[PDB]
Amino acid sequence: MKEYTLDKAHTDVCFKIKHLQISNVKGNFKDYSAVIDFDPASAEFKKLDVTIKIASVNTENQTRDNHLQQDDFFKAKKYPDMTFTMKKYEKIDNEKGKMTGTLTIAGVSKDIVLDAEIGGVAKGKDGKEKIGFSLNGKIKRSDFKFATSTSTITLSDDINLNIEVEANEKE
Amino acid sequence: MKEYTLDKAHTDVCFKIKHLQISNVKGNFKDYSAVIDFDPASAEFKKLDVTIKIASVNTENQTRDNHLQQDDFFKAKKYPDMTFTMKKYEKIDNEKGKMTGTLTIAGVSKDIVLDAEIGGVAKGKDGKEKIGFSLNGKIKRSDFKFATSTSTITLSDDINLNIEVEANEKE
Amino acid sequence: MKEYTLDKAHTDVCFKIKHLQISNVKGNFKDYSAVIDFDPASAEFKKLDVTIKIASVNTENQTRDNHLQQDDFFKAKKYPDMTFTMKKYEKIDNEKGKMTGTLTIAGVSKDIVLDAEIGGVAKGKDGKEKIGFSLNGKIKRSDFKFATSTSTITLSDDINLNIEVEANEKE
Amino acid sequence: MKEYTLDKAHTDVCFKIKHLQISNVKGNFKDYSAVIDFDPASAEFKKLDVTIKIASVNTENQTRDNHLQQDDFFKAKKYPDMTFTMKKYEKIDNEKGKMTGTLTIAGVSKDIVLDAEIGGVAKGKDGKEKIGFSLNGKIKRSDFKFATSTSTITLSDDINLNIEVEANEKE
Ligand SMILES: O=C(O)c1cc(S)ccc1[N+](=O)[O-]
Numbered sequence: 001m002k003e004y005t006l007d008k009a010h011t012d013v014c015f016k017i018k019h020l021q022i023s024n025v026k027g028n029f030k031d032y033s034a035v036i037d038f039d040p041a042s043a044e045f046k047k048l049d050v051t052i053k054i055a056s057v058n059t060e061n062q063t064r065d066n067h068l069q070q071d072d073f074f075k076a077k078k079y080p081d082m083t084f085t086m087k088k089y090e091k092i093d094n095e096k097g098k099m100t101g102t103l104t105i106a107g108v109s110k111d112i113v114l115d116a117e118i119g120g121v122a123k124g125k126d127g128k129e130k131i132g133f134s135l136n137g138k139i140k141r142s143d144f145k146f147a148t149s150t151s152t153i154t155l156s157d158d159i160n161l162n163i164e165v166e167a168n169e170k171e
Numbered sequence: 172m173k174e175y176t177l178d179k180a181h182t183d184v185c186f187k188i189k190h191l192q193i194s195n196v197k198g199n200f201k202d203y204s205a206v207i208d209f210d211p212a213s214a215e216f217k218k219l220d221v222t223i224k225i226a227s228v229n230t231e232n233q234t235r236d237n238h239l240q241q242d243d244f245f246k247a248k249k250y251p252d253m254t255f256t257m258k259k260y261e262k263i264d265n266e267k268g269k270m271t272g273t274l275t276i277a278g279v280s281k282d283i284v285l286d287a288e289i290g291g292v293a294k295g296k297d298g299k300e301k302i303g304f305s306l307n308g309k310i311k312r313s314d315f316k317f318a319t320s321t322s323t324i325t326l327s328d329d330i331n332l333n334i335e336v337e338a339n340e341k342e
Numbered sequence: 343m344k345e346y347t348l349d350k351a352h353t354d355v356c357f358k359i360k361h362l363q364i365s366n367v368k369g370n371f372k373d374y375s376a377v378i379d380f381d382p383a384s385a386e387f388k389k390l391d392v393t394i395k396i397a398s399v400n401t402e403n404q405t406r407d408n409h410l411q412q413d414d415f416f417k418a419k420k421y422p423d424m425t426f427t428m429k430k431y432e433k434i435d436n437e438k439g440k441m442t443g444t445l446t447i448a449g450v451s452k453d454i455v456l457d458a459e460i461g462g463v464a465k466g467k468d469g470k471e472k473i474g475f476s477l478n479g480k481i482k483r484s485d486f487k488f489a490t491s492t493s494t495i496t497l498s499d500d501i502n503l504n505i506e507v508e509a510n511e512k513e
Numbered sequence: 514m515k516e517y518t519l520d521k522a523h524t525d526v527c528f529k530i531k532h533l534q535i536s537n538v539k540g541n542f543k544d545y546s547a548v549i550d551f552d553p554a555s556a557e558f559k560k561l562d563v564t565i566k567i568a569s570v571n572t573e574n575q576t577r578d579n580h581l582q583q584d585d586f587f588k589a590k591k592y593p594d595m596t597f598t599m600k601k602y603e604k605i606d607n608e609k610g611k612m613t614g615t616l617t618i619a620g621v622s623k624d625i626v627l628d629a630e631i632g633g634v635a636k637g638k639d640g641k642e643k644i645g646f647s648l649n650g651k652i653k654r655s656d657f658k659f660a661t662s663t664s665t666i667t668l669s670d671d672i673n674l675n676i677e678v679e680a681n682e683k684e
């Protein structure tokens with residue numbers, strides 16, 4: 001034989017190991033519209049109707065947003081908007097309520113409960129009405145047979161929703 | 172009631188969904204030593220003995236490197252170095268061979284096979300010998316009862332090793 | 343050379359592949375006690391206080407139940423019971439309500455909301471009062487720094503609770 | 514109010530929690546054929562050619578076997594058999610060797626190395642030749658763009674192969 005000494009400069013004692021990391025996908029939507037009927041005297045919602053253009057999804061990452069619109073997700077060609085229709089607002093107190101409504105995603109419809117938390121009624125300095133408020137709730141992808149190709153392992157069956165709203169009087 | 176129009180500027184139609192992402196952890200070690208005996212006439216390794224200071228792990232992320240040394244991983248206090256001892260080199264041809272040796276990690280020892288691929292023998296311009304070569308192989312964390320607290324789900328049971336070596340003659 | 347024909351009887355063309363399966367752990371508790379104060383005239387809970395002996399966990403699998411009591415879970419030696427204390431019952435209607443209370447698990451306490459669904463008030467055939475009802479709600483393991491060693495990947499951060507109750511008048 | 518005592522007989526203090534379990538899928542194939550040329554004087558394989566009918570997969574579970582043949586896996590209609598063609602057998606010693614060959618799965622072909630371990634040459638009691646032997650090796654699903662729809666998380670990128678063979682002389 002013959003003996004050698006490492007050249008530490010061009011020698012790697014090296015390893016790869018595969019691990020998982022769980023992480024949240026957060027996204028809003030740039031383009032959506034709503035009808036909001038709300039009686040500040042009794043702090044009750046009367047009519048809440050939301051249409052969201054799927055096209056305008058924003059999960060801060062373009063190559064995913066595009067992918068969201070494909071058959072294995074939204075089908076934005078066939079089903080271009082998702083919609084929410086309030087069917088009932090059960091008041092808890094002036095700050096809180098239980099809003100039941102119809103969610104439709106890719107033409108499939110389920111009744112869901114959202115937690116209304118009134119961020120605060122006011123009559124803005126200009127003399128016209130404003131309100132803050134938020135709607136919170138969990139929906140199951142499985143309930144809307146959504147992204148059915150994707151396993152409940154890779155991506156959560158649970159979607160959490162937070163609709164933050166400022167909103168001003170009409171005409 | 173009363174009617175409101177969204178203020179799109181301070182309104183988020185928002186969602187969070189939890190998903191997993193598989194990813195490789197790659198790390199070398201800054202401080203290690205080796206005894207390398209190799210006969211270029213027959214391209215056979217004769218003795219290969221490596222000691223790696225666990226302390227010097229580098230997975231390009233300090234807060235993980237530190238964590239690697241704790242009880243649930245390396246135990247670098249109790250077991251400060253991991254070691255490899257060649258017990259056999261079965262030659263395939265001048266470029267390839269099957270190196271069997273003893274790996275010890277945190278005082279637990281298993282015989283492992285590495286795939287020797289000679290990157291190339293030479294007599295460097297200065298008239299002294301050099302060799303390139305690499306050792307490749309998979310080891311199982313479970314085989315060395317390693318990081319036993321961490322599930323084989325979160326972090327792979329499989330560790331892949333690639334030892335890249337340049338090495339020059341002695342004295 | 344020489345030619346051979348397989349003996350299909352003692353020949354396996356064989357493969358192993360590792361895959362994940364998500365699955366629910368369902369468990370009750372054999373031993374627990376409660377104080378239940380409820381006014382059938384207004385269908386409001388007045389006081390709801392539950393103590394559950396951790397010891398009596400039953401996830402239909404003994405070797406897991408035992409393991410539940412160890413440091414990396416319940417610590418049943420140090421913290422032998424988990425407890426729920428009602429702090430507020432906000433009535434929705436006669437069938438539904440929002441119960442807020444203090445949950446304590448291994449000595450850590452958080453206020454949680456449960457969804458009360460009255461399964462039905464009655465005056466049983468014997469002339470004494472009975473009530474059915476259920477409490478539903480999600481709690482986060484992370485909120486109670488629970489099983490902190492176990493990753494939110496292996497085991498869900500979310501625990502779902504369903505307390506089904508039949509209950510009869512006192513004395 | 515009024516006070517109630519639980520009826521422990523019809524009361525569940527109950528919980529669901531979602532967890533993952535990693536597990537091996539093991540399967541053979543019922544129907545396959547091979548050409549085996551092997552020189553017991555030098556214990557070298559000369560020609561090894563295997564064709565496996567995908568149709569005959571057996572992972573001890575019919576509803577999965579069927580599913581294996583669909584577009585998101587084998588495409589057994591379009592690509593009814595997978596095949597292995599030996600291109601080289603590098604002998605280690607009389608018990609061991611490194612077999613390089615072409616694997617084709619759903620019409621995609623990669624060269625793979627299998628570890629030949631001769632279970633034992635003999636001349637059986639009837640005066641004719643027999644041999645035992647096994648071929649072991651890992652292949653990557655990704656290398657054969659296989660089940661590409663299924664994430665490397667749900668199902669391992671790594672497939673392990675063990676071909677166990679008894680085999681008798683021809684004519
Ligand atoms: O990608 C690489 O070349 C590689 C790098 C390191 S540090 C360890 C193992 C490897 N493997 O397994 O190939």
Ligand SMILES: O=C(O)c1cc(S)ccc1[N+](=O)[O-]
Pocket residue numbers: 026027028160161162183184185186187
């Ligand atoms: O972290 C938040 O405040 C949040 C943000 C968005 S965009 C959606 C849901 C949320 N939830 O569930 O809270």
Ligand SMILES: O=C(O)c1cc(S)ccc1[N+](=O)[O-]
Pocket residue numbers: 354355356357358539540541673674675
């Ligand atoms: O456990 C076994 O012996 C084994 C069995 C089969 S069918 C395939 C691969 C294997 N490996 O990888 O060892």
Ligand SMILES: O=C(O)c1cc(S)ccc1[N+](=O)[O-]
Pocket residue numbers: 368369370502503504525526527528529
């Ligand atoms: O499936 C059920 O009815 C259920 C059962 C138990 S023991 C706990 C929670 C549950 N949830 O969340 O519904």
